[PDB]
Amino acid sequence: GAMLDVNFFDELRIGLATAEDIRQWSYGEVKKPETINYRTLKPEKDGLFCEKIFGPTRDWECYCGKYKRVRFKGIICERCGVEVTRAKVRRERMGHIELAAPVTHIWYFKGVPSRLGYLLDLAPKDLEKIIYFAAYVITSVDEEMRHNELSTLEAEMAVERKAVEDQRDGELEARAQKLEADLAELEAEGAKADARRKVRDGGEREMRQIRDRAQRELDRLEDIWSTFTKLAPKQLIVDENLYRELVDRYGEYFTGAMGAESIQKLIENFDIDAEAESLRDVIRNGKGQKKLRALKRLKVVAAFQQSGNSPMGMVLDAVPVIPPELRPMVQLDGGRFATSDLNDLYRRVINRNNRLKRLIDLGAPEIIVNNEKRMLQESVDALFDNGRRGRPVTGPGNRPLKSLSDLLKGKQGRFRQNLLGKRVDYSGRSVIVVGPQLKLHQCGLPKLMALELFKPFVMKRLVDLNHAQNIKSAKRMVERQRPQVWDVLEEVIAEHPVLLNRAPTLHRLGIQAFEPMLVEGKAIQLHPLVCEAFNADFDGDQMAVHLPLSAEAQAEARILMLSSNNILSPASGRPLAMPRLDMVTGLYYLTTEVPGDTGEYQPASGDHPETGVYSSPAEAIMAADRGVLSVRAKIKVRLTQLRPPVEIEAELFGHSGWQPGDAWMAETTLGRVMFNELLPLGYPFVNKQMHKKVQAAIINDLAERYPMIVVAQTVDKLKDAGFYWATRSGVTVSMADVLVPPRKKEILDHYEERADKVEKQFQRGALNHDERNEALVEIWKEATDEVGQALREHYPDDNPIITIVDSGATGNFTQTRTLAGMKGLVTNPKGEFIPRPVKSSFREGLTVLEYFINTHGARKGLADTALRTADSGYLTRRLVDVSQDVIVREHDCQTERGIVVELAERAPDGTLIRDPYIETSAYARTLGTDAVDEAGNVIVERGQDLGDPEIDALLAAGITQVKVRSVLTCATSTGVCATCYGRSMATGKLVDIGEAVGIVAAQSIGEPGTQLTMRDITGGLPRVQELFEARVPRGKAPIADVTGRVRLEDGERFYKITIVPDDGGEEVVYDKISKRQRLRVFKRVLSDGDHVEVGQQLMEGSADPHEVLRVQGPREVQIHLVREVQEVYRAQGVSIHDKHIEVIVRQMLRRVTIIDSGSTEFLPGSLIDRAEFEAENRRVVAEGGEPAAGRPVLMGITKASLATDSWLSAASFQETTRVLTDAAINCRSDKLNGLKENVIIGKLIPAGTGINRYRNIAVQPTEEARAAA
DNA sequence: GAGGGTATTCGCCGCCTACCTCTCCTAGCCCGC
DNA sequence: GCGGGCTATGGCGGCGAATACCCTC
RNA sequence: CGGAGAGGUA
């Protein structure tokens, strides 16, 4: 269509190649197994590197040397025949090898299921035999002629049997004569009875051999007759001698072959329409396993029938050769060439082909020719796919060779190593250190990495400033680092953003744009507030740097990816540039009020006026800096620049506001005034100790009420204040600080008494081993709890350890107990607790045995961590693949469908208790209906963001359930609409019209995978994997299918649960329920003669998703899946808004399984898209309707991803060979429309700034401004 | 012995990302100089 | 006689398809 | 700079 390519691509088609196509591609033939000569270091002729086939090896030159200049352009050499052109042509031209005998393609023969077996209706073993010269196949038979001659041939063979039996009977008459002769021979004298019986033994044993000769020789003819008369095509006869007898006796009436040519002949004499009709008949009728087999047979046959693609492409007559420059051969140090894997396989094929050609041409016995044809078949099979059948062809050192198939498959294959990832210029890498003087939009770049990243700009500016007359001098001056290159560089790098990236890039914020400022050293200086977003630390971490060049890239960096614009987590909406650790400690210390502090406010004592009332924060600062006042002391100041609180302002100023400049009296500490002076001017006074939660709330309110620049400035000021006041807080560690509980020994002795009593009871046989272990474990768990409580009580409130823990800076009190009080129980390598337990804290010093038994759990955790980091990436990749085509396309579909959120179910006694999990179920949603309470007016109008004010008003009105718009019910044909999706968590406003929400959902779900521990019912990452894969859970618990009472029965290893419906139509029953599983408690535990709902889960465990869909429909399975995934993630304290899971689930319920084909062409049991199914049914019903029938189906993410309409997106995900071989048979065309496909073909992705409405915007100066010029 | 219904076993597919340093790629034997 | 080139029984889970064992006609 | 193996950092 477009030869090389050149853009304006419209479709990419794939299909089988016939011998004609393969011979048209080739520019020549390879018929000599010679690669390159050593003396002249030139390719040979008619080899794998010939310059007369693949192209010249030197630009505008000939192997002849006749023409070696551009003037001789386009002329084919008259001496050597090599065309004169550029050397790059060797990357394009291909050659072919003309096989002496037909060869089958291994993909369509060995790949399970065998696509030749279904096509020809032959078992895989029959193909294995016929193709590898071990059996004979009847390619043809003559029926009418042989039927006519059957009557005569019957009599002919009857006469021939007459000859056999009559010769036998005459020879037996001779045997009888010899028998009488022997009788007389031993009767002429006195012989022995054993002698007579011996002559009879010999003679009559050879007469029994006469009878057995009749038997065997005539059964030979009977077998010949039976085989010949009933023989039909596609019959395999072993014992070549039998076939030789058949052909010799009946040369005509049939034709038998052996090898790939036999299969080629069979395919040639094979009509497709008749077979398709026969299979359709067997499908419409018959039933049974025959119908199931006919379904697959018809799949393949209709695939080969619908298109103009003959099935004769499976048998090869020519073999294409890849261009040489894509399979080059290099030389090790010294000049010794090491062969590539492809070259060796090509050489083997060529050798075998030539030797077989010689053997056939010179004439030879059939055995030798057949053996050589088999050895050529094997070599050609190994070329395409080495190791599929038989032992892999191994090279030096016993390692299998890399075939042509290996180039396309695996993590090191073409796709996932070269098309989905690249090596890019204008990038570097170095270690990262903390720069506390930077700003959120700034980074520090060494003054030796910038000089290399920004080289061309520096050269341009040097030439412009007349520092270098030309480009070469500027280049060399840059390479020599003259003192002025730095002066020009500082100007060059100004206002040019830089992209920094840390691996692994779990989520979106792993790449952010900053502004470069040159620093001293060789490390990168990273602002402390982006570490959580990058998940970076300063113990040896490294990062990469990228530089966008073009104007669009710079605009994207400056607006989309700038760090100061990305403060909130896209997954949940919580801030990520919040202070942490040292900043939290400093602010927490600053905004504290310690009673009885220096300079504290004192009421009037009756002799002197009040002490501690100041007339301005300036005077308070003066007093503090004079040592008379403490920053953490309660004072009464007179504030005129801080806006008063809500209550104080309401009761003091009222009116409209405080109108900056007014004065009011505050009773607070100096530190809190200092802190509130950091917040925006209009923010009401905050008078509280700044726990991490309080700071988080302040930052979130700022984000949701103010512009983002205000938030950035506020966080920077808080950073400065915290880093200043952490140094003065006085937090250090010494063994004097690590206090020990005062009465640890008493508690340990008290519980050791109980342990001893349990041990003595065990000794007296009162309990077994497990009971003793359980009792000891409970005793020691209680002991550890008491020790921890005592330790918590003992510590003062200003201890550095307790201050750091309770400040929210980092850590938890379990570590404090381990350090000071006691470590307690430790786990065996199995996972069970050691009943000892460990009894010394790390302050005292564990003994040798305690340390050794601690090492077990110490190592098991690291091993599990490695396993989990391995497990999570696969799930993330699968999620990204399944839902990569979900993009916001419309502003509003104006539908009315919606879902209902629990939204604070009412209390029994009467009260509105808020549902704990409401932030991830109601916020950032738009109402699909109006909210009316107690016949009142609408509280919230349809189409409202439903934020904090809205939810608070709804709760105040007294309504528990509301209907909201969701992606599960969007009515857009392709993609979701903005209103159904709702608010964008990162931006805080309605999502844009080019938002790729599928990838955001995938990264949000997969990023907190390592945190989610991998801990017989699955309860972690395996549980998530089986939920998203829609597999049978494990502890599958039956679910009712019709409401009714149950006659519960009790038995060992089985429980009979019968569904007695209220209607009484029929009773379902399950008797295989093992006694190990419990009975679920619904409404009291499940009991005999108890009515149950339709979807109630009788037993305990996990329900299978495929049955709830059958019983309760799609909505119920959707809510079930969302609830299960949310439960799994909440168990580990991770918050993910339900819209991401809703996107993922929506991508899993998108098809319908077909039942009745009707006038429609859908085959029974196939998975068909719902939109296409409905469209086809509606089209058909117009004209004498015979609509097809379908049912909802649930698919896993892997199947849903491999059932794509693009054969290029599925081949880059998994199972490249199977996808390619099926697509080639179905002759699928790829309409390139998607993120992955456009990335692969190097075209703008259809999302974000690549949509038509954005990429095709027009700009011009205004008329007024144009005139003002 | 073929049919239809169960079990049973074997083969294939999958198993995170980025970066740094260091050592080695046949053996036999037959022909040629 | 030595060098160079040519040839010749420590993964594991899921899943499906190719095939053991038993009642029926 | 193509392959195989060994060790290591986040």
Ligand SMILES: [Mg+2]
């Ligand atoms: Mg680190």
Ligand SMILES: [Zn+2]
């Ligand atoms: Zn020439």
Ligand SMILES: [Zn+2]
């Ligand atoms: Zn919609």
